[PDB]
Design a protein around this ligand. Structure first.
Ligand code: NA
Lengths: 215, 217, 218
């Protein structure tokens, strides 16, 4: 179109189709902002990394926007089923896929390169006096990537797994949690020793993944 | 001002004006707008924060205008050091009510981001004669707990825990309370031995914390 | 240099110049300034980070210039996989010293944001014959634990936890160590059965993590 100067209300403005200032070699192009340097301006792109979300809405002649937010880092997986875990964890099945009983499956997608997932499993469990084993398995692996231990005296108790896992890409990954007795015994999740409801209601165990940037 | 044109600043031939209108812009640059290129011609893009980010513009002088990006404050911690005798029980009949156990803490928190969650962690040092411990988070204005967890003591003190995540509705400040009681059974001491004395003869510290996080759906 | 005006770039009637001064600006665009609209005329506004935000200008380049906005690295994880016999106890007499229990780990962390906290969690696999486990976190320099927690083992391995919040006061490296021992009596094994055998025949992993957060000051 045209270019020049014009009065807008009381403001004396320059106008043109586009602009090239300083060290720029072409006019402002897609997603570039005019950025000052020690000398003359450059055309710079704004970009997000490490858990930052950058949303450029570039398709409005009038109502364009750039929003800076946090990438969605948190994934919660409630587990409310009562599950009888008859699968034992033994010295011969611990480094296989066969130990314990799967009590949940969780699919997550990293949003940042070189990130970790902070994983918390907090599982309400009951067994006749003895040990509980919890194991986290990555689908495609041939053995658990994290292993933890809890305890029940007969009455329900919280049994926990805390770990961090290194993320190798930006695609969906499926994890499963398996629970079973240490070397022997039957373990109930979200129930009493006999499979009955704890305090006669539905109870809730939790698994969560918090994506964090590691040092 | 009120002028426009070209002028030499030191050796740099600069354009100058009260304001600028380029590309698809219908008006000159307005509040919080930057000039932003497209595959076509530029637009005026309003710059804004969301989801746990604050965007802050400081304009002290013509030569020191500032735009600060930073994290919104996400972490709320609530120490509990009192020794509380929890003679309130948790029972099949009081569990789905507000009367189970004994209240050991009250927590008011305010979400900074819409549709956020709170990662809640209650880590409570508790003692009782061999048996089970029950913990309940109650949201003020509910008829029953929003989270129930279980612990154990053999008679020596042991950490009892409640982990949950709660969906925030708005930016309204909200109060939660933590209740602790015997699993239908006996008496439970928090931050103390089963007889109510100090563990190791010192004051001990239980914790409740709320971490505001942005959830993926 | 020194040239300016309007030129045709393809079909685009463009203003060109070495630099630009608009609105409330009293000088042309200077280092890391952008042109920002106000409710008035525009200002030159420098972008800066704070509160756990990283902001870097790939600037001394005419080609591939950028401003990247990233989170500062907040997470620090410290796996402990060795079997450790803890023969030091915690007693009323030593609980406020540096002497209670056995040191099972040392961790140097460095806060990225001033006035932040570390959310600290220690999750330790421990066995001992029937009784109490005590966990104590110590800042190098201090004279006694800054945090104390309790666990339990019936004889079979059990997870023993410490969860706490530490207020960071500088941007300088700080060292913490974790100590574990029996409550008043007994031997406690970390990452092992009570006799020191590998649990389930394998190497096990205990974890100590520090997550930097920005606290709501209330
Ligand atoms: Na026991």
């Amino acid at each position: 179109g045209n270019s020049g100067f014009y009065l807008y209300n009381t403001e004396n403005c320059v106008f043109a189709d586009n602009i090239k200032v300083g060290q720029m070699t072409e006019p402002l192009k897609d997603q570039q902002i005019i950025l000052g340097t020690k000398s003359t301006p450059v055309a710079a792109k704004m970009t997000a990394s490490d858990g930052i979300s950058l949303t450029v809405s570039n398709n409005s002649s009038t109502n364009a926007s750039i929003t800076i937010g946090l990438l969605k880092a948190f994934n919660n997986f409630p587990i409310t089923n009562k599950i009888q875990c008859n699968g034992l964890f033994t010295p011969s099945n611990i480094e296989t896929l066969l130990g314990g009983t799967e009590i949940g499956k969780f699919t997550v997608t990293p949003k940042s390169s070189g990130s970790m997932f902070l994983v918390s499993a907090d599982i309400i469990a009951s067994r006749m006096e003895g040990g509980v084993v919890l194991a986290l398995v990555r689908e495609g692996d041939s053995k658990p990537c994290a292993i933890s231990y809890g305890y029940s005296s007969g009455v329900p108790n919280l049994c926990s797994l805390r770990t961090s896992i290194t993320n190798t890409g930006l695609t969906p990954t499926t994890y499963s949690l398996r629970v079973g007795g240490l070397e022997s015994g039957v373990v109930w999740v979200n129930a009493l020793s006999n499979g009955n409801d704890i305090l006669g209601i539905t109870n809730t165990s939790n698994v969560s993944f918090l994506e964090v940037i590691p040092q």
